[PDB]
């Protein structure tokens, strides 16, 4: 109910190293691919939990 | 963004709207051509008599 958001900004993200992480039960992308997280750009990305 | 079985989808949305727009293009462009023929056979017939 209380959801925490944080910003991310200003940093390179390696994708791969999450990703390759099994200890994830679900992942799950719908707007893009999980392989090709590790070449597109973004303004900014923010990560709710 | 996407892999390939997930961009077919999009892909093909894109084709089906820029055919459409090509089609639509094309036979405005017949009708306008048949009547710019007709025009030039006037003009044609006008020069000769
Ligand atoms: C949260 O902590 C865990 C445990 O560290 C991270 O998972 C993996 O942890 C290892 C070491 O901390 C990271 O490097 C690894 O090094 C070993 C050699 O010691 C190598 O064999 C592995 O392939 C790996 O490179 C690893 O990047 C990291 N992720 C993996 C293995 O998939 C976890 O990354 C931490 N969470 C975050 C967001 O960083």
Redesign the pocket.
Known sequence: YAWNRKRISNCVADYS??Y??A?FSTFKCYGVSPTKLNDLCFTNVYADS | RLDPPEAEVQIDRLITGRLQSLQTYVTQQLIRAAEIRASANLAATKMSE
């Open positions: 190293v999450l390759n992480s200890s």
